[PDB]
Amino acid sequence: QTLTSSATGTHNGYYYSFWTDGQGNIRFNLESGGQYSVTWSGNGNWVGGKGWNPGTDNRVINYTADYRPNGNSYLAVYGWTRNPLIEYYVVESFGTYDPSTGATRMGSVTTDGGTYNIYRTQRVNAPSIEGTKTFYQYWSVRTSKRTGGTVTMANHFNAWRQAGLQLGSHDYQIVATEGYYSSGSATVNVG
């Protein structure tokens, strides 16, 4: 089950979302259980992974990953909420670009053996799950990169809410790999 374009659905009990601007080279493959593999290069812009839809406030995610990025890429729990429309990330690892660069810091949270700095950014009239919109992005960036473990979402959501970052009704929630003008490979297994 190799994807040929942006796509969503459920595979082996896991929701999957793959978004690509169609550029560069990329092969996103759905695999057994909560696993997926992706190999990419060139000048593409994409993000995809497996998880759940809808996400929940208290989900405890367990994942493993063989992550090998080259350039701007992220390995992170990724999801959205509506009313308010929010795109969020729990960045476990990343490449050459720290997504919080120049972002407004909103404190930090210690969870699952790691420490994460919290940030908020804004996207103006950009693609979203509701079409072209202007929305906030919430980030939890681990101070030390890792590619596997447990992520207790309640600790991230509550840290954000307490810092004044409101969350809406949950849309999808996945363990994603993302890249922008980067290259590399990754095999991620959720659960």
Ligand SMILES: CO[C@H]1OC[C@@H](S[C@@H]2OC[C@@H](S[C@@H]3OC[C@@H](S)[C@H](O)[C@H]3O)[C@H](O)[C@H]2O)[C@H](O)[C@H]1O
């Ligand atoms: C830097 O981030 C880059 O990768 C991630 C995307 S976000 C992307 O936005 C589109 C939605 S799918 C969307 O749903 C609504 C209907 S109306 C529309 O036709 C669909 O395309 C994806 O789930 C989400 O991952 C950034 O845009 C991009 O810059």
